[PDB]
Amino acid sequence: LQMIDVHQLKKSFGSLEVLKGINVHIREGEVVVVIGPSGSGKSTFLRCLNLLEDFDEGEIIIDGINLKAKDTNLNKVREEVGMVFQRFNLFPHMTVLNNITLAPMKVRKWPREKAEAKAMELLDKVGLKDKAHAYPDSLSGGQAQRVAIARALAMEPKIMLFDEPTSALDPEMVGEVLSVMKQLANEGMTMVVVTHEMGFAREVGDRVLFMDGGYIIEEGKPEDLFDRPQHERTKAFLSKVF
């Protein structure tokens, strides 16, 4: 059972508790959308799942693997989980192609060149094979983020975490990235997607989790949560985004 299992997870940056007891159970192939104001721990939660962040209390089990067990191969799980940030996914001094093959070639000891056959692959997947030999400075935000996804997908992960992949793009460039994330969900990928694009949520998401104050205030199918929120706070937040 369960691809992602989180129990009473708590995190504190110094003296401040950022996550105050989070419980989440994500099934394989589920697309969970996380929403909520800024500073409610959305990004911190994702960093814990991708092991970029350590935590205080609770347990985190990635596909049967507890992240804090003695006999755990942590780097096995690190490769297992891919992540796309709102910004800073690409190295500006490297070509799009080399960006995508940097990790597989160096971590997965893989491949030196199935190393780049994989990359040309995904580039066609996101519709930018035509940009293989370009540098990040030539790409639009929309293209750059599509490349960041192809880069995360390059490691062949079972889980894909998106941290507001489009919130830094102007209105007209959001569509192309979301479209790729949609095609990804339709392919059976387990995805935890933090976003404010409540249109993508409805369309692609299985469940939605509304976070606020380091707690998960309410959850439920997009339809039910966006149309019929049950908690006032969920209303107070939705009534200024949807």
Ligand X SMILES: Nc1ncnc2c1ncn2[C@@H]1O[C@H](COP(=O)(O)OP(=O)(O)O)[C@@H](O)[C@H]1O
Give the footprint of Mg ion on this chain (CB under 5 A): 42-43
Q: Could you tell me the smallest distance in angstroms from the CB atom of residue 53 to Mg ion?
A: 12
Partner from its own copies, ligand X, Mg ion, none contacting 41, C-beta within 5 to 8 A by type: ligand X
Helical H segments across 3-106, by residue range = 42-49, 74-80, 96-106
Which residues, numbered 25-44, are part of the site for ligand X (CB under 6 A)? 36, 38-44
Backbone CA torsion sign across 68, 85, 18, 203: negative
Q: Could you tell me the smallest distance in angstroms from the CB atom of residue 73 to ligand X?
A: 27
Q: Could you tell me the smallest distance in angstroms from the CB atom of residue 48 to its own copies?
A: 12
Contact code string over 83-112 relative to its own copies, x by CB under 8 A = x-xxxxxxxxx-------------------
Contact code string over 33-52 relative to its own copies, x by CB under 8 A = ----------x---x--x-x
Which residues, numbered 145-174, are part of the site for ligand X (CB under 6 A)? none
- Nearest Cα neighbor of 33 from 173, 236, 190 is 190
Rounded distance between C-alpha atoms, residue 98 and residue 165, angstroms: 21
Residues 6+ apart with CB under 8 A from 4: 24, 25, 26, 49, 61, 62, 63, 159, 190, 192
Q: Could you tell me the smallest distance in angstroms from the CB atom of residue 79 to ligand X?
A: 24
Count the alpha carbons within 13 Å of 4 in the hemisphere toward its beta carbon. Answer: 26
Q: Could you tell me the smallest distance in angstroms from the CB atom of residue 43 to its own copies?
A: 6
Confirm or reject binding of residue 160 to its own copies (CB under 8 A): no
Q: Sort strands 215-220 and 207-212 into parallel, antiparallel or unpaired.
A: antiparallel
Rounded distance between C-alpha atoms, residue 15 and residue 183, angstroms: 41
Which pair of tokens denotes residue 25? 């159970």
Residue numbers at the binding site for its own copies (CB under 8 A): 13, 43, 47, 50, 52, 83, 85-93, 133, 135-139, 144, 163-164
Binding site for ligand X (CB under 6 A): 13, 16, 18, 36, 38-44, 133-135
